[PDB]
Amino acid sequence: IVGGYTCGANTVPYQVSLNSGYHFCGGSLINSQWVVSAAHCYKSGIQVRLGEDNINVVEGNEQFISASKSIVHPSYNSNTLNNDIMLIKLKSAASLNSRVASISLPTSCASAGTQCLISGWGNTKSSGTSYPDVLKCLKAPILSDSSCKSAYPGQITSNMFCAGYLEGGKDSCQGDSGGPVVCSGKLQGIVSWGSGCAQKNKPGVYTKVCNYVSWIKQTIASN
Ligand SMILES: [Ca+2]
After folding, report:
1. Most buried pick, 37, 172, 194, 214, via CB within 10 A?
2. DSSP string spanning 169-216?
3. Residues 97 and 48 in one domain
4. Total structural domains in the chain?
5. Where's the Peptidase S1 domain?
6. Whole-number CA gyration radius for the chain
């Protein structure tokens, strides 16, 4: 996250880190056995880390649970990043309290202008590299479909939305991928892509979760 703020330990209790020897993507906990992330985060050898604040220090709230099954969306296209969403089933159910908690799925698609919270352990610089040890947070609005399509002509599908600032300076970034965009207490987006980070006229693009609720609910019910 570029231009954001230190969230505070366990203020984002649905946030997960996906770890394959090191942190490589975020995710969101949607119930005690399932995590949602980006299909472009797919890897074998995934451990899910819950209740994390500092990813380099075991502080006490953490649960580390291996994945038993991964399900990339059946129509995911790695060239266009259309349908950039994946589900990960945990080997055992997480213990849910106040510092590990699930986030609800939306029942409606959120409007342009809605303020959302984005979080992750990704790069904090628009030029160069600095990865934080603690979770960063960013408040950003959803942009209109027309401003999104003008920032990225011919690249935005009905399964994506833009959020952030056209003036640049504040954005998600590499290493935030797969992580949550939460608006009005629901998971509306998944960190997906963008051109660099926090560049003028190049806001972040997110998977539009409201389009996938049926697939998610049916998949969870059957696996
Ligand atoms: Ca930790």
Report:
1. 172
2. S-B--TT-TT-EEEETTEEEEEEEE-SSSS-TT--EEEEEGGGSHHHH
3. yes
4. 2
5. 1-221
6. 16
- Residue 129 to residue 51: CA distance in whole angstroms: 25
Residue with tokens 């950039």: 84
Say if residue 171 carries a ligand binding annotation: yes
**174 in a labelled binding site:** yes
CA atoms within 13 A on the CB side of 29: 29
Residues 57 and 146 in one domain: no
Give the list of residues 6+ apart from residue 154 with CB closer than 8 angstroms, or none: none
Q: Which residues surround ligand 1, an ion (CB under 5 A)?
A: 52, 54, 59
* Rounded alpha-carbon distances, angstroms, from residue 24 to 55, 105, 126, 128, 153: 11, 24, 19, 18, 29
23 is catalytic: no
Same domain flag for 86 and 166: no
The separation between CA 68 and the C-alpha centre of its own chain, rounded to angstroms, equals: 20
Say if residue 18 is in the same domain as residue 121: no
Residue type, 140: A
Do 128 and 189 fall within a single domain?
A: yes
- Given the structure tokens 């987006």, which residue do they identify? 189
Write out the residue range of the structural domain in which residue 37 sits. 13-102+211-222
- Marked catalytic residue, from 17, 23, 37, 40: 40
* 17 and 53 inside one domain: yes
